[PDB]
Amino acid sequence: HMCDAFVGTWKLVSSENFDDYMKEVGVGFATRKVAGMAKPNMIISVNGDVITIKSESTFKNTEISFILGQEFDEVTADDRKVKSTITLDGGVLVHVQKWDGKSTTIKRKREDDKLVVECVMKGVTSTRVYERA
Numbered sequence: 001h002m003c004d005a006f007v008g009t010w011k012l013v014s015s016e017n018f019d020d021y022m023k024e025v026g027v028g029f030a031t032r033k034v035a036g037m038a039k040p041n042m043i044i045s046v047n048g049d050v051i052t053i054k055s056e057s058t059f060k061n062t063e064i065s066f067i068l069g070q071e072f073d074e075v076t077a078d079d080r081k082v083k084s085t086i087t088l089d090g091g092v093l094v095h096v097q098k099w100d101g102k103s104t105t106i107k108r109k110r111e112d113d114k115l116v117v118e119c120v121m122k123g124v125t126s127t128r129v130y131e132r133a
């Protein structure tokens, strides 16, 4: 019952500061424009100890599965090859990606009826809000 309140299908409703986040990550111009335009559906499910997160959009359809605290290799939608670890910290899903000596942290939390996604790369944060689909 670890992630019950995250499970379901969620649709993007707002984004702020996201182009600047992606710049900080090192995403190139054309990918920033098309990815920034994406309006993903995020599908979160749990089966035993395995969490699956899918992001479906006109840009890319991506899927990760993982166990909390257990690192994995991830290919991001912008083609970074990263080492990822996802944990639950005080009810917040915390996703850290490491690559090329860089690090970004993506936090997902339930707030009211929303799923709020905070994306941080150095001093740049972007806040994205999802609603139930």
Ligand SMILES: C[C@H]1C[C@@H]2[C@@H](C[C@]1(O)CC(=O)O)C(C)(C)CCC2(C)C
Binding pocket: 022, 027, 035, 036, 038, 040, 042, 055, 057, 076, 077, 078, 106, 117, 119, 128
């Ligand atoms: C951290 C951020 C990364 C970002 C994806 C979105 C997202 O995961 C945040 C979110 O879930 O809304 C996106 C736009 C679907 C594809 C391109 C990236 C760079 C991999």
